[model samples]
Target: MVPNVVVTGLTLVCSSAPGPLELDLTSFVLKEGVEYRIKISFRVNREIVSGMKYIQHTYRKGVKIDATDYMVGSYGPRAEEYEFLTPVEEAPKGMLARGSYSIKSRFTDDDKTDHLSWEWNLTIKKDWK
Candidate 1:
């Protein structure tokens, strides 16, 4: 959070996990015109033999702006180095409004599928530093 703001508003924030996973961001704020480089990291409580995943970014309740699907991992041990890129080219083009938005994801293993989703709230402001 910037220190000089008199009014309590959204502050500039970015992430570099950059493995876009590790979802739990309720405080990340982004400008409309800014380019957000989202990094996705994988996390699993149970063993992942071989699985698939889907990720999507939405402006509002049903307005999907960006989405993707890929093989989560053929194999890993958590300690193994891994990095994934989820480049959101120019946020303004994707974000249509200044309200509740979300980055939803789902993972599947064999016949069973597990869903995990996270929401991020942002607002529109002209002056950003």
Candidate 2:
């Protein structure tokens, strides 16, 4: 059953995560002056029992190309795995990259009934060859 979980925390506006999504940056590659598609995955935590309304995510890349997007819809129960894309774009010349991705989400049952906020994480990198 789905308990109060995040809905109980009334004082909290938003935070980092309910947990992290399983990730691998080997497949999220970008190139300078070249557009590329990116995929992000989230292997839901065993703690989350409620469904999410939307997901807003970002992958930081210092001075290079970064990927970010929103998955607007309902999530699943526990062990809910998720995957999405960040469209495509030509990256910059920045070389260093890491899994600096952070995700934010909203938990809603029927639009405005609940004000629960959820979160997850992801990773990314860039290429120019």
Candidate 3:
């Protein structure tokens, strides 16, 4: 008998205020020597006789700002979750300082495509008080 295959679902989560996902300080706060945590979660499901591979996370910084490379990872079949965290460091002095960031999660199965992405802006503040 032939088996059935399908991509059930996908989810992406992050710490950002309500609004557009762009390089805006109003959504996220940045503080020098301050601690901040960012988390991302993914949930996926597939049918019998189905398989997939390859997963990655993409990250980027704004102008005049330095950031590390994109944090990439991998996963297998079934439903699962993924998370990440980062601290705020020395940032440019000014208001409305813009920066761009995104996380891309992709995979393939049965000649079909299954991908998900989450992106947001990062804003820095001097004080958490």
Candidate 4:
């Protein structure tokens, strides 16, 4: 099939992550109070995609923590994968913040065409270990 908008990969970038890290609940550890950002890598094919957006929902122990939406704008077909990064965000601090969390994310466009949907998990600790 000819790709409309292909979602290549997703990753988180932070000082504690060691490098551009893929999400994994077992080994991916996050440090409380550390700054981080998410990067979505995609490729547009066939035509232009307008009003591209990123939607994210974060939950901890079944309780919803936050919902973040990012307006990524538009792009035309390109051979190379394009990346969009969310604004720098600070991880929650304090004892209550140290725990496991689940994240649900999606990418969409003006016509509500969903480019991708994915889920990942992470654990927050006092330090990167």
Scored by TM-score, the top model is 4
Model 2 lDDT tens row, 27-125: 222333344433444433334433333333343443323333344345444444455344454444444533444445443443353444544443344
**For residues 1-129, what per-residue lDDT tens digits would candidate 3 score against the true structure?**
322322222322223323322231114544433333433333334443234443445455533333333332334435443333233424445445433334344444445454433344454455432
lDDT of 1 by residue, 1-129 (tens): 421101111122254222222343223445556665455444432354455443545555667766666554554445443344554555463435554455554444454445334555444434332
TM-score of 3: 0.38
Between candidates 1 and 4, the one scoring higher on TM-score is 4
Off by over 4 Å in 1: 1-27, 44-48, 57-67, 80-82, 93-99, 109-112, 122-124
**Location of the lowest summed lDDT over 10 successive residues in candidate 3:** 17-26
Question: Which ten contiguous residues of candidate 2 have the minimum total lDDT?
Answer: 8-17
Better of 1 and 3 by TM-score: 1
lDDT of each: 0.44, 0.38, 0.37, 0.83
Best by lDDT: 4
Can you give the TM-score per candidate against the true fold? 0.51, 0.32, 0.38, 0.90
Q: Candidate 2 at residue 105, lDDT?
A: 42
C-alpha RMSD (angstroms) for model 4:
2.8
- Candidate 4 residue lDDT tens string, 20-77: 4774221357888889888888889779989999999998888888898999999999
Residue 7 miss distance in model 3 (angstroms): 14
lDDT of 3 at 93: 52
